[PDB]
Design a protein around this ligand. Structure first.
Ligand SMILES: [K+]
Length: 642
């Protein structure tokens, strides 16, 4: 079972590595050491693995001139960058990319000693959670809606009166389709082109037409023209952006800056990304792109100019709680949504929520995390077609046209890390054949030998300075012992001291971590091995408080030791950000906005966050961080006032 998955992975890497080809005798020793039976039983299990690898899209070439044969995959290369993914595989891969991104952020903040996202992380461009909630709520309650819409001819801003039939994703971008009562015909609206939040007309009713096909309506959509942007950027900055550059040269007058061109289709999408970069970029052209960036920066300046609301939070007993930090149960359930989403009849929300024993709204939030969170960097934009009608979500299968995707070594390795965490989730009663398994094998071929470290949550070697702590944690877990932990602060000038119940030791991105129930925080935390100052048994048995309580976050989602606590004001349009960042507390504000207290992983990410969201966010406290963000925005704005 597990030995077959691992055996396939090892076989695939051995054949990929050899440029000359390996004979059967060498493969037996390298991969099939486990098989205690001789050539007879191994020979057929080898033949079965060859057949099985071919079904994952790997053709084993035989070079010979019996037992005289040599085998290899990929001919002279040791990677296969091109894979064909089914919709199920692509959706799993989407969750994996989200896990990688959280791992990458933790490592960048933790290993910092002037903000800059790490390699393989780009700003997250996603449809607004609130607008999504409002369309979904409108359809559920059979209410028509109204919203500001910037016209197809980029003409006047215009309020549209719509009966919503469906939401849909094509080319990574989300659309609303519905009956436009002003035109008396159906119309498609790009969410990015809405000027307002959606007002749900809860006094009204409508029925959608029985003969309405959301997939056929959205399939008729034609991709936007690929336009060219001209950008001046600071040297040695904005790595994800430079990955997209079609040309590069020194900037005409500004020292230490480059002039690049990048291709984009939707200018609202590019402007949100570029606003997140603040003063590190200036749009020189085109003007529609430039005006969108300034608007976001300016709307962010103006919100910080607005007077401060009172910092009054309710007792949080009479309020609806924000999204909780994602747990292993939720991750496992989201994997189990995939077969519904790709089945020919799709995912019927009420019926599937009942089946999992959760509310309708809880199930919708699972889906928003999974498929409405945008595409991380290194995840391709032309992989998933999504339709979301009233109570009905389905990822359309384009028959016998698996979309080929190319991954670099780095992108495949990053994704394998997210897949290996998904692969380490608790085993259920019911393995083989799943989409998780198949996309893991395919991405392994795209990473080559780098898959061996990246595709594992346990094999990484241990630096000598960490070996002592690695052995003490290992033994404490095995013997059920509590540990007294002295943990370095980020700067390593101080230590916190605390009793912990060690639970799991695991590696990610060449880093060792241990999950432990911390008796000082009274919750599960995930610590970096290379930040342990010392660990000693304290003579007590593990308390077992981890299994007590309610659920706890999965390992990439626990609050970090280095988090900085920030109080935000959100507009109604941006109210969904309080869920994205698992707000500790919220307070509703008169016009549908809210106060939100959130933990950010690093104070350096905050100005990018605020400028990215272009007026839907402001920092209230602490004052130091608020002004430091206003300076980022002001420095960004002063590039254009000339
Ligand atoms: K090869």
């Amino acid at each position: 079972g597990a030995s077959r998955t691992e055996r396939l992975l090892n076989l695939l890497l051995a054949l990929l590595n050899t440029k000359v080809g390996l004979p059967r005798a060498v493969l037996r020793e390298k991969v099939y050491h486990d098989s205690a039976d001789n050539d007879v039983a191994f020979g057929r299990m080898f033949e079965r693995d060859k057949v099985d690898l071919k079904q994952f899209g790997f053709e084993i070439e035989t070079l010979m001139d019996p037992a005289s044969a040599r085998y290899r995959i990929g001919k002279d290369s040791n990677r296969l960058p091109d894979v064909s993914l089914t919709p199920a595989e692509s959706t799993v891969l989407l969750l994996a990319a989200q896990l990688w991104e959280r791992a990458a952020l933790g490592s960048a903040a933790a290993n910092a000693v002037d903000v800059d996202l790490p390699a393989g992380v780009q700003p997250r461009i996603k449809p607004a959670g609130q607008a999504f909630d409002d369309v979904v709520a409108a359809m559920h309650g059979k209410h028509p809606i109204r919203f500001g819409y910037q016209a197809v001819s980029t003409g006047r801003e215009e309020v549209r009166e719509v009966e919503p039939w469906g939401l849909g994703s094509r080319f990574g971008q989300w659309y609303l389709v519905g009956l436009d009562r002003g035109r008396g015909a159906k119309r498609v609206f790009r969410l990015s082109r809405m000027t307002t939040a959606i007002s749900v007309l809860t006094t009204g009713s409508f029925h959608p037409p029985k003969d309405f096909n959301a997939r056929a309506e959205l399939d008729e959509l034609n991709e936007l023209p690929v336009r060219q942007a001209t950008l001046v950027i600071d040297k040695d900055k904005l790595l994800a952006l430079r990955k997209k550059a079609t040309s590069l040269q020194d900037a005409p007058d500004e020292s230490g800056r480059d002039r690049i061109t990048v291709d984009f289709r939707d200018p609202e999408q590019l402007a949100e990304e570029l606003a997140s970069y603040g003063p590190h970029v200036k749009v020189t052209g085109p003007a529609e792109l430039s005006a969108a960036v300034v608007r976001r920066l300016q709307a962010a300046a103006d919100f910080d100019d607005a007077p401060l609301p009172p910092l009054e939070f309710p007792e949080a007993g009479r309020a609806p709680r924000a999204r909780k930090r994602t747990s292993e149960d939720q991750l496992a359930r989201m994997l189990q949504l995939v077969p519904f989403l790709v089945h020919h009849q799709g995912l019927h929300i009420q019926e599937v929520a009942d089946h999992f024993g959760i509310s309708r709204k809880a199930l919708i939030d699972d889906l928003k995390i999974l498929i409405c969170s945008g595409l991380p960097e290194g995840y391709p934009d032309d992989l998933l077609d999504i339709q979301w009608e009233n109570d009905h979500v389905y990822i359309s299968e384009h028959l016998d046209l698996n979309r080929p995707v190319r991954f670099s070594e780095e992108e495949a390795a990053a994704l394998l890390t997210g897949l290996a965490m998904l692969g380490d989730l608790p085993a259920l009663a019911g393995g083989s054949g799943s989409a998780l398994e198949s996309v893991t094998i395919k991405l392994t071929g795209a990473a080559g030998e780098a898959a061996r470290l990246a595709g594992s949550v346990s094999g990484q070697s241990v630096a000598p300075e960490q070996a002592q702590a690695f052995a003490a944690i290992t033994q404490a877990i095995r013997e059920g012992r509590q540990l007294r932990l002295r943990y370095f602060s980020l700067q390593r000038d101080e230590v916190t001291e605390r009793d912990v119940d060690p639970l799991r030791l695991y590696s990610l991105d060449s880093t060792w971590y241990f999950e432990a129930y911390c008796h000082s925080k009274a919750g599960v935390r995930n610590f970096r091995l290379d930040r342990v100052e010392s660990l000693e048994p304290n003579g007590r048995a593990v308390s077992g408080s981890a299994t007590a309580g309610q659920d706890f976050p999965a390992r990439l989602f626990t609050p970090g030791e280095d988090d900085v606590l920030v109080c935000l004001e959100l507009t109604r349009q941006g109210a969904g950000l309080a869920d994205d960042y698992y707000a500790e507390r919220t307070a509703p504000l008169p016009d549908g906005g809210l106060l939100a207290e959130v933990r950010f992983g690093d104070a350096g990410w905050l100005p990018m966050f605020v400028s990215q969201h272009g007026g839907s966010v402001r920092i209230l406290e602490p004052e130091s961080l608020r002004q430091e963000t206003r300076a980022w925005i002001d420095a960004a704005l002063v590039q254009y006032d000339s």
